[PDB]
Amino acid sequence: SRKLILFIVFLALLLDNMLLTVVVPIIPSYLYSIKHENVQVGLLFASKATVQLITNPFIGLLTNRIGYPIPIFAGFCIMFVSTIMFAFSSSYAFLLIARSLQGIGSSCSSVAGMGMLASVYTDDEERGNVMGIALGGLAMGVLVGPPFGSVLYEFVGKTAPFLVLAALVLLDGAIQLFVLQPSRVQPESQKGTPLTTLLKDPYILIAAGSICFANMGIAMLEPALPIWMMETMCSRKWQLGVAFLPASISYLIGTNIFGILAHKMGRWLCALLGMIIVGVSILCIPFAKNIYGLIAPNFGVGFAIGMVDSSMMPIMGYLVDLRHVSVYGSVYAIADVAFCMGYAIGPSAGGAIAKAIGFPWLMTIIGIIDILFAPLCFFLRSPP
């Protein structure tokens, strides 16, 4: 009964993303009110991803020395403290500290859970099958975070969403203490193929680069689209929110379908087609004149990104099993880093380029870069 571990990682990802998307609208308003009663806000937004990026390799090295369960339970304890600090703290320094601890706990959870999933489901097809479901938790959390936070802030109070999240985190921790049972410290068997040797591999580099560019696309699209919308179409407030919902729905559908469908078609071909489709959709985005023109390209973007992730997350596993020692916590530490890249320099770099040249040229450059990198996935094909 290893489905409990899958449920644990699914819940961890879901709750992490729920907190991430719940905290996003509340912080700018009351922070500005307290200042009354650009650089710092960008620093606050990027601190979580920066700290996660910095602490990924250390978790990758520590899971080899002590194992997965102790790092996972620490992810529950840091995320519980971050959720209670977010609920009770109202100053800038305490906010920065909470967002940074959230980053540390999210690094622990992501790296250790992906390593444990890869080590428990050692079959090649089942690995992708379960990683698709686990990646679906991110989409579910992003989808259900904003409405949950909005209603709970609307009716009960400001601290109510955070207290409810804390109760759910406690339930998750109780389940973890029942099944995971992190009582003693157990070392792993063999060595870990140090990061310096793994970073010289061109195939791992190609997979990581594909993930990084595919995610940086949406990471720079998401905060730069409403600014263009309000100036071109003069859209209303709710239309700014409902326009990016097709991306979140299509990501869920595409992940859950292609986690199973990528093995039969070919992981390299699925990644190549995902790159081509996301590039074409980003290129067609600037031509839209009203919300209905934007519905379809967003669906294409989400579908393609789901394809790419659900094909390239299980391959990072297959490449170390094939060319290195079968220890996963340090290779997934690389993969997670790719994600953090998109979340670290995404919004800031996207803003400056858009002010300097314009938004259609930014989208054209993203699309051209994705289209040109797509042939590189041809080298990822299995030799037989």
Ligand SMILES: NCCc1c[nH]c2ccc(O)cc12
């Ligand atoms: N790595 C998946 C990122 C992603 C895919 N679809 C999304 C929709 C909204 C969002 O904030 C993020 C995403």
